[PDB]
Design an enzyme around this catalytic site. Structure first.
Site, PDB file in Angstrom:
ATOM      1  N   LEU A   1       0.882  -1.153   0.000  1.00 18.89           N
ATOM      2  CA  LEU A   1       0.000   0.000   0.000  1.00 18.89           C
ATOM      3  C   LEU A   1       0.920   1.202   0.000  1.00 18.89           C
ATOM      4  O   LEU A   1       1.284   1.733   1.078  1.00 18.89           O
ATOM      5  CB  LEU A   1      -0.910  -0.015   1.254  1.00 18.89           C
ATOM      6  N   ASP A   2       1.340   1.623  -1.184  1.00 20.31           N
ATOM      7  CA  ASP A   2       2.502   2.492  -1.291  1.00 20.31           C
ATOM      8  C   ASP A   2       2.290   3.797  -0.600  1.00 20.31           C
ATOM      9  O   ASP A   2       3.223   4.360  -0.052  1.00 20.31           O
ATOM     10  CB  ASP A   2       2.909   2.761  -2.737  1.00 20.31           C
ATOM     11  N   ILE A   3       1.082   4.320  -0.689  1.00 14.49           N
ATOM     12  CA  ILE A   3       0.809   5.638  -0.139  1.00 14.49           C
ATOM     13  C   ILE A   3       0.866   5.625   1.393  1.00 14.49           C
ATOM     14  O   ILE A   3       1.573   6.447   1.997  1.00 14.49           O
ATOM     15  CB  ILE A   3      -0.510   6.186  -0.672  1.00 14.49           C
ATOM     16  N   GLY A   4       0.177   4.664   2.008  1.00 14.91           N
ATOM     17  CA  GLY A   4       0.200   4.499   3.457  1.00 14.91           C
ATOM     18  C   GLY A   4       1.446   3.872   4.082  1.00 14.91           C
ATOM     19  O   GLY A   4       1.718   4.075   5.287  1.00 14.91           O
ATOM     20  N   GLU A   5       2.208   3.095   3.310  1.00 16.64           N
ATOM     21  CA  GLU A   5       3.346   2.373   3.880  1.00 16.64           C
ATOM     22  C   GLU A   5       4.692   3.055   3.620  1.00 16.64           C
ATOM     23  O   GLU A   5       5.660   2.812   4.346  1.00 16.64           O
ATOM     24  CB  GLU A   5       3.361   0.921   3.410  1.00 16.64           C
TER      25      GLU A   5
ATOM     26  N   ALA B   1       3.688   8.958  -0.972  1.00 18.37           N
ATOM     27  CA  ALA B   1       3.968   9.499  -2.301  1.00 18.37           C
ATOM     28  C   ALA B   1       4.724  10.822  -2.218  1.00 18.37           C
ATOM     29  O   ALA B   1       5.298  11.244  -3.197  1.00 18.37           O
ATOM     30  CB  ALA B   1       2.701   9.674  -3.117  1.00 18.37           C
TER      31      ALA B   1
ATOM     32  N   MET C   1       8.439   9.637  -1.182  1.00 18.83           N
ATOM     33  CA  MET C   1       9.112   8.906  -2.251  1.00 18.83           C
ATOM     34  C   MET C   1       9.390   9.750  -3.486  1.00 18.83           C
ATOM     35  O   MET C   1       9.861   9.230  -4.508  1.00 18.83           O
ATOM     36  CB  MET C   1       8.279   7.686  -2.662  1.00 18.83           C
TER      37      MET C   1
ATOM     38  N   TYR D   1       9.651   0.603  -8.806  1.00 24.05           N
ATOM     39  CA  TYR D   1       8.619   1.227  -9.653  1.00 24.05           C
ATOM     40  C   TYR D   1       8.785   2.709  -9.774  1.00 24.05           C
ATOM     41  O   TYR D   1       9.256   3.379  -8.828  1.00 24.05           O
ATOM     42  CB  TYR D   1       7.194   1.100  -9.103  1.00 24.05           C
TER      43      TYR D   1
ATOM     44  N   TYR E   1       6.079   5.882 -10.484  1.00 25.68           N
ATOM     45  CA  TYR E   1       4.703   6.335 -10.680  1.00 25.68           C
ATOM     46  C   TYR E   1       4.659   7.793 -11.093  1.00 25.68           C
ATOM     47  O   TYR E   1       5.035   8.654 -10.324  1.00 25.68           O
ATOM     48  CB  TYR E   1       3.926   6.151  -9.365  1.00 25.68           C
TER      49      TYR E   1
ATOM     50  N   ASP F   1     -23.074  16.360   3.278  1.00 25.68           N
ATOM     51  CA  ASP F   1     -21.621  16.426   3.038  1.00 25.68           C
ATOM     52  C   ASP F   1     -21.114  14.979   2.840  1.00 25.68           C
ATOM     53  O   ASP F   1     -21.266  14.136   3.749  1.00 25.68           O
ATOM     54  CB  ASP F   1     -20.914  17.031   4.234  1.00 25.68           C
TER      55      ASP F   1
END
Ligand SMILES: [Cu+2]
Ligand SMILES: [Cu+2]
Lengths: 654, 654
Positions: A301-305, A308, A311, A388, A390, A596
């Site tokens: 889970l690239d964003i949470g682990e 972005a 990195m 990778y 992105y 909302d």
């Protein structure tokens, strides 16, 4: 301190240092290190009150995550910068947090010096004194049920380089060291039953010097294509506030999501109309498809682990952004609480985008003609997640549409393949002894809409033939068809997938308003077809840790701080428990009609590797778009000067 | 006539004139007019034998379609150019041929002068002395069971202009005149039950003088974006033969398909490998979804009923094509047998296309980095189908992929709406008194493949989870998945739709060869998700006249002259009978595994108009790609000079 003008602005280097001094002194006499120091964005209500109702300027707040030598898990809380004080804190003994650049960089040296790893390297055919040739990409362990969150762990995917300039991916080793991040020590190595020794092949390399050896010569340098803007650009930035072709919005950036776009409005001939309050990528998962141990632990889970933002590449240093570019820098904390800076993290430019529209009259052989060219605004970043790349491009367009384009490049994750060994059906032999496993790349786009103002809803739109049969009075010739709109009343209604059978799209709309001509509510329509089902089964680690990924759309009530759908602290969570999207969905019954809302969209690709992908992969594209429909009363680009225009009367004169 | 450089080159003006002279002589004393004179392309086997085996030079042939005054239907045949004789001839009394610019341009004055039409204009609130303000877009009647092919008919979609510079589409009238094309007379008028008089609203206009009145001022001219190639282009044309970045192919053009790309190969380091023999658009259908009379007659098959060549725009003036451009002209016949020319019918250029690939090593903070930019080659045309504009871009890429990009623009088809009248559910009220009906735009891409030579097959590829359950030894963690490949054996197997549930793609491959790394056959993969189902019901007029459109994929045996899947003469065919795709599918039993095959792919969009689309529509994109997968043994772009490159050793140095 000094306050920035804009409440959505990222923390400055001064403010980061102010945050960490405050946390240092609140934990007086304790050995703490910093994991995250970042803006706590103000409450949506407070912000909108300040923007529009003359409300007070929201306090400037920093969210921190720290570790304490000898304490399990983490501590997190809020620092109020104006008063240099900690206003909220709690200990979370049983989660592990995002892995920072510093948490990661020490892992190779740990494995290089570890005696059981050294012996595994020797058993694999690499001498103990060539340990400088052994590399690893350090990952979170992701989730392993042997340890849970009890220690903070990484897994080291191990490779071999003959020469420091090799691309190591042609040369994976067979075994997998597990490394305690905080003790800086290897605690276990996963060793397969069938040993496979290092490949004896040449490395699969890709620099020009390598390519000269491999195919004889480079192609000649191609005649250039140059892009100048002699009179400068049409967009205008004030701080992080962008104005361009009637759009106005704030470009933020943080450690985790990377680019965050806020407070998006469109100036409709003097009527300034809100569209989104916030839009960003909120989580990813990249689940691999080999069932063999330990490969179930590949599902980053690239964003949470990793983040972005953390990195992200400095841009410009290569030729990533071509033309006249405005850059933004990113600011973070290191372990000691000192600000770090990534320069040129974000790039902002405008580009030609082909035709916007054109029409000619056949009556005077197309002498009556109007042609207007399109310009797009691009706000972009590129992050590297070990192997990778992105490439993320947020695109604004002159018909009022907003598009997200992604390009995946970098290098395939590879594992070793034996001489006699079949890679299929879970992978591809992309090079001798190299197995590139199947995987998916999935993203969760989080939209906080504010379509023409407050009180919004969402709906599925499905093309359907008329239910009346061919030859009936109602459908004589059997051609009738319509769009069936299903407005989501409760959370559970929203849980929906892209459907090719109906060319399904989704509307986010304001049911309090009405287009004067069409009588339909103003809307932005999500047009998105790169929407893979999650292939991992119900109840799998992948599906449990990423509960957002099992549907193309999840719409839940807005609450402050509902950012991260797989939870606040992602690494080594088993997927059990009521948190992130699974919390927000609840029993499914809460209202999402005219209130909302938050609309989380899952999209991405399923990648079955081929030799074309190796040793370095050609960009693979992904896109979705959000288009105004019944938002305007006509084409909003018609006031842009045509490239060429001749009327029927002018044609006659000419 | 002098024969061309290349057997696939379109007829020259000289060859057209020689052909028409020959046909005039054969039919001396008969009042004939010319509908089509165009290249009859060589048999596939003859071309290949000539090209690769020192075989016979194939005869240069012209195909012709003529009308004869007072005779039903058409005559068609072949002229042998070398010997100036007619070598094949037949009479087809019960078909109607494509409508040329000339057949069409007549209708508007016919209806202006017809006492019954004039009467309807007066009933509609337009005075008989103002017939010069009445306009129509002349369509084929498409199909009407009242006349069959017994007469050659058009239907006139009638509109009104207060001024000649108005866009007429905000003011449709309520009735529809049916015109005999050869007699030049109105034979009937479809008049609705509820009369709606002409709109009294202002015209919805879009030139700058119109926008100045409507919104006060034009936006200022934007600062320019200049694109130059000071050292020339990298592509090379020799006549119609293109060479660019290892691709080589022939760019053809005809009245019907427009651009035809032939003999496509890739030079893989000196091994020149065939990819496609022929690729083009071979048919369209644009079916409207209002069931009310007479709107079932709107389902234009634009290619087969008007022609993407005949409708094509001369490109230079619009700045449609930005940069350093190579132009091709198109040559057709007029009704008298004389060559006509459309200048700059095809534009050819190379553009920037972002990143080709990128990778950086995190170990030295991305100091180790390689970045290569992508250039794309674009071969494009734009055609006008009365109200619509179709922008077509054939795109070659440096990873060896080929893409078709389409952008739809121009003006919605509009019919009148009473003050009272609800447009929904078949249409949208896009302006007062204006109903823009729902419709699909569907296209039949025709691929004649030659993947790495002769003997090809096709398959569907469907992503699937392992059938083994979560927690079994085969799939312990439930993450396993693979690509399920279904090779088409007979024609019936191939009749397949896009499926989101499996992220379906289609391979075209050479089962006689094997990739030496992956062990899979070389292939081009069709990646295409804009694949609407056909919404008109089975048995409907739309489904019968376009048998190809009810499946995303149709694959049939190759035969010469299997070009046009709705039959050779499309207007006024009822859709009954064994011809076009229906004939080629036959009983669905013929082999298509490892043989000469033809792959017909239906793609497009479903369009539910909104006010944003009116009075002129912003471009709507459509795309598909054919990508090499297991064709190469590695990324084929790696010998292109990087924009930036720094190795690990080079980075240690400064
Ligand atoms: Cu991938
Ligand atoms: Cu349309």
């Amino acid at each position: 301190p000094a306050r920035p003008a804009h409440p959505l602005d990222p923390l400055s280097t001064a403010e980061i240092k102010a945050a960490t001094n405050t946390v240092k002194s609140y934990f007086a006499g304790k050995k703490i290190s910093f994991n995250t120091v970042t803006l706590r964005e103000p409450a949506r209500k407070a912000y909108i009150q300040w923007k529009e109702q003359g409300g007070p300027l929201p306090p400037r707040l920093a969210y921190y995550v720290i570790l304490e030598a000898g304490k399990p898990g983490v501590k997190e809380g809020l620092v109020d910068l104006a008063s240099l004080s900690v206003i909220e804190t709690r200990a979370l003994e049983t989660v592990q947090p995002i892995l920072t650049v510093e948490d990661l960089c020490s892992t190779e040296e740990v494995i290089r010096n570890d005696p059981a790893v050294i012996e595994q390297c020797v058993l694999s055919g690499i001498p103990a004194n060539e340990m400088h040739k052994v590399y690893c990409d350090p990952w979170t362990i992701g989730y392993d049920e042997r340890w849970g969150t009890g220690k903070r762990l990484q897994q080291a995917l191990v490779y071999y380089r003959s020469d420091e300039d090799d691309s190591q991916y042609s040369h994976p080793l067979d075994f997998c060291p597990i490394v305690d991040t905080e003790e800086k020590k290897v605690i276990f190595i996963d060793i397969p039953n069938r040993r496979r020794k290092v490949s004896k092949h040449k490395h699969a390399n890709f620099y020009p010097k390598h390519m000269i050896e491999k195919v004889g010569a480079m192609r000649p340098e191609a005649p250039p294509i140059n892009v100048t803007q002699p009179e400068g650009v049409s967009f205008k930035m004030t701080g992080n506030v962008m104005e361009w072709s009637n759009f106005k919005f704030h470009i933020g950036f943080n450690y985790r999501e990377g680019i965050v776009l806020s407070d998006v409005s469109y100036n409709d001939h003097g009527n300034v109309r809100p569209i989104f309050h916030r839009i960003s990528l909120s989580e990813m998962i990249v689940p691999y498809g080999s069932p063999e141990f330990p490969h179930q632990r590949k599902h980053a889970l690239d964003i949470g682990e990793y983040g972005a933002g953390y990195m992200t590449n400095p841009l410009s240093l290569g030729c990533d952004c071509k033309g006249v570019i405005h850059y933004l820098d990113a600011h973070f904390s290191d372990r000691a609480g000192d600000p770090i800076t990534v320069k040129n993290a974000v790039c902002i430019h405008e580009e030609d985008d082909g035709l916007l529209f054109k029409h000619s009259d056949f009556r005077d052989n197309f002498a009556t003609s109007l042609v207007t060219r399109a310009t797009k605004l691009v706000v972009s970043q590129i992050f590297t997640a070990a192997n990778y790349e992105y490439c993320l491009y947020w695109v604004f367009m002159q018909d009022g549409a907003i598009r997200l384009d992604i390009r995946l490049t970098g290098i395939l994750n590879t594992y070793i393949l034996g001489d006699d060994e079949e890679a299929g059906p879970w992978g591809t032999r992309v090079y001798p002894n190299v197995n590139a496993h199947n995987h998916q790349h999935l993203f969760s786009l989080r939209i906080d809409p504010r379509i023409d103002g407050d009180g919004n809803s969402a709906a599925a739109c499905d093309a359907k033939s008329s239910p009346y049969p061919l030859g009936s009075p109602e459908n004589m010739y059997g051609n009738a068809f319509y769009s069936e709109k299903t407005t989501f009343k409760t959370v559970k209604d929203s849980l929906t997938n892209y459907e090719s059978a109906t060319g399904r799209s989704w509307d986010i709309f304001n049911p309090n308003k009405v287009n004067p001509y069409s009588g339909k509510p103003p809307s932005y329509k999500l047009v998105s077809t790169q929407c893979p089902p999650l292939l991992a089964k119900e109840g799998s680690l992948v599906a449990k840790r990423a509960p957002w990924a099992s549907h193309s759309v999840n719409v839940v009530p807005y609450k402050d701080n509902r950012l991260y759908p797989s939870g606040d602290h992602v690494p080594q969570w088993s997927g059990d428990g009521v948190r992130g999207m699974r919390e927000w969905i609840g029993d499914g019954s809460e209202n999402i009609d005219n209130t909302d809302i938050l609309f989380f969209h899952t999209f991405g690709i399923t990648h079955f590797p081929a030799p074309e992908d190796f040793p370095l992969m050609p960009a693979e594209p992904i896109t979705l778009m959000l288009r105004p429909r019944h938002f305007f009363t006509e084409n909003p680009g018609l006031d842009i000067q045509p490239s060429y225009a001749m009327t029927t009367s002018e044609a006659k004169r000419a």
